[PDB]
């Protein structure tokens, strides 16, 4: 899909969603294509119109670089989106770790971002359920509980784990909260299971 020059081998995410005139139904898009084939005499003018349609796409299509979260190859690619849905994962030749190389995960596995199962609000364990609580009240609850177990049994009885799936800033903030805030050294990640030996 990445190496195809034309739209011959292209992701279904782009199909019917990239531009404005391409979401038209095929039963009513193909006759328009035949009309334009039989109408325009020189490719220059309709090519300019297609360049305008490319500029059209440029506004709605957001192309931002990112690095795949799944595995440690750290392949970097642009993620062509239209609002919130992910249309394409386009690698670039300038990508250091992969260039154009990509796997199924990093190039077609990003539907989890827009998944409805995603936790949009903080959840607090109320009785035997998870109540959708406000951000501020959840923050106050966690802070108060951590202060309680920090000033009762000491910070040494506090242990926090950062995700190896999160950015460097995230793990640095975990370890700073443990040491520069809580005062404990009990921190780890999946690397204890993965890269510690």
């Amino acid at each position: 899909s990445t190496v195809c020059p034309c739209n011959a081998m292209m992701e279904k995410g782009m199909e019917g969603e990239a531009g404005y005139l391409t979401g038209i139904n095929n039963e009513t898009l193909r006759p328009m294509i035949e009309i334009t084939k039989g109408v325009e005499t020189g490719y220059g003018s309709i090519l300019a119109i297609s360049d305008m349609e490319s500029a059209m796409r440029d506004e709605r299509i957001k192309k931002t670089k990112t690095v795949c979260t799944y595995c440690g190859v750290g392949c970097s690619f642009d993620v062509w989106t239209k609002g919130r849905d992910i249309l394409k994962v386009e690698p670039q030749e300038e990508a250091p770790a992969n260039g154009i190389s990509t796997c199924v995960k990093g190039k077609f596995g990003w539907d989890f971002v827009n998944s409805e199962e995603r936790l949009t609000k903080p959840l607090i364990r109320e009785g035997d359920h998870f109540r959708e609580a406000e951000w501020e009240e959840a923050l106050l609850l966690i802070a108060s509980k951590f202060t309680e177990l920090k000033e009762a049994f000491g910070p040494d009885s506090l242990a926090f784990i950062t995700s190896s799936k999160c950015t460097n800033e995230e793990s640095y903030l975990m370890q700073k909260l443990a040491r520069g805030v809580i005062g404990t050294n009990n921190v780890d990640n999946c690397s204890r299971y993965c890269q510690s030996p």
Binding site: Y20, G23, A55, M56, D58, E59, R60
Partner: protein, 61 residues
Amino acid sequence: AKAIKRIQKIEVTEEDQRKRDLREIEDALIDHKEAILETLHMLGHMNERGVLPLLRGLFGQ
């Protein structure tokens, strides 16, 4: 009653005049409720059809 000519106009501050004119605009909206609904549907159907996004690409780039 004696002879008095001067008129003490009521002190309508900026807040009161703004509220009165906003109420007038709201009443005008009320008179054209169906028209406003039709125009909102206009925008909705244009945006769904991509006409409004097409113009958004036209005027953004």
